[PDB]
Structures are given as structure tokens and as C-alpha cells.
Write an enzyme that holds these catalytic residues in place. Sequence first.
Site, PDB file in Angstrom:
ATOM      1  N   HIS A  50      28.827  12.100  11.618  1.00 15.24           N
ATOM      2  CA  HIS A  50      28.053  11.912  12.853  1.00 15.24           C
ATOM      3  C   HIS A  50      29.008  11.517  13.977  1.00 15.24           C
ATOM      4  CE1 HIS A  50      27.559   7.357  13.350  1.00 15.24           C
ATOM      5  NE2 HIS A  50      28.327   7.515  12.281  1.00 15.24           N
ATOM      6  N   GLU A  96      32.681   9.929  13.357  1.00 15.25           N
ATOM      7  CA  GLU A  96      32.732   8.751  12.473  1.00 15.25           C
ATOM      8  C   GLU A  96      32.153   9.073  11.085  1.00 15.25           C
ATOM      9  OE1 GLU A  96      31.057   4.499  13.468  1.00 15.25           O
ATOM     10  OE2 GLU A  96      33.036   4.450  12.488  1.00 15.25           O
ATOM     11  N   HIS A 137      32.399  -2.761  10.194  1.00 12.14           N
ATOM     12  CA  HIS A 137      31.547  -3.764  10.833  1.00 12.14           C
ATOM     13  C   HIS A 137      31.858  -5.100  10.178  1.00 12.14           C
ATOM     14  CE1 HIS A 137      28.725  -0.229  11.774  1.00 12.14           C
ATOM     15  NE2 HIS A 137      29.414   0.170  10.705  1.00 12.14           N
TER      16      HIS A 137
END
Length: 150
Positions: A50, A96, A137
Site C-alpha cells: 500500500h 510501505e 510503530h
Amino acid sequence: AVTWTCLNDQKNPKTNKYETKRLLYNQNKAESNSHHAPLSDGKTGSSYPHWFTNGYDGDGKLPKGRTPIKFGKSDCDRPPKHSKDGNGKTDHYLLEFPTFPDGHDYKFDSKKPKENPGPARVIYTYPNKVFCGIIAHTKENQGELKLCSH
């Protein structure tokens, strides 16, 4: 070769606490996984690879609180001219892909079902695919994607 390591906060259910684990990724695997997946924003089973907003909106400008992961490239920092499916004539958007540490090529083509993705993800332009780096993250798989460091 290179060892892209990230520090994600995992909420261990045993201790019901958040711990900062060191997610070591092998670039060879990232640059390899990315050299296996098709170059198309949201056009596969799992959708992946994506387009990576990278803070951008899909043109070059960023929304409220501009925080584009600075890799140290001019093309990676360049405006990701993401079209409808990020696949024009020469679209140069930053993709990504959910890169894995094991070094396996997750079933990104498997729409349904589709196991949960990964925190650390590979970032790279297109069709250049000039492997910029890996970002994860710092808070599990949601918190601000902090560009891992090798």
C-alpha cells in the site's frame, strides 16, 4: 548485510504492561520482500504494498502536523504523486510493505483470510524501489512510525 532495528512497545498480556522490545530486521529481507511484491498501491489481496502517505496527503502537502519520515533521500522526501490506485504512467509514490523479521514473504496476495500485518515495514520509491529504510510503530503497530536504524 544491514540490520534495521526498531523499538516497539508491546503490551504484554501476562504483565499487562508495555515493554520496549528490539525488532531487528534484515534489510536483505526487506529489500527482498519488496523485490517480490507487485508495485501497485492497494491492488493485491492484503492490499499490500500500500502507498505510504509518509505524512503526505497524496500529492506532496501534509495534513495537520506535518511529520514526513525523513530517510535522507530526495526521491523518498519527494512528492509521492499517488494517483487512484497509485499506478499511473510513471507514478513515483512511496510504498510501505509489511516486512517480516523471520524473512518470510507474508501472504500479501491473500485477501481473505489475511493474518494481521507487522509493525516494522519497508519503505521504498517506485519503480526505482530505491530501498530507503524500515519504519515501525514505536507503539505496537499504530504509534508514530519511527524510521528504524541500522
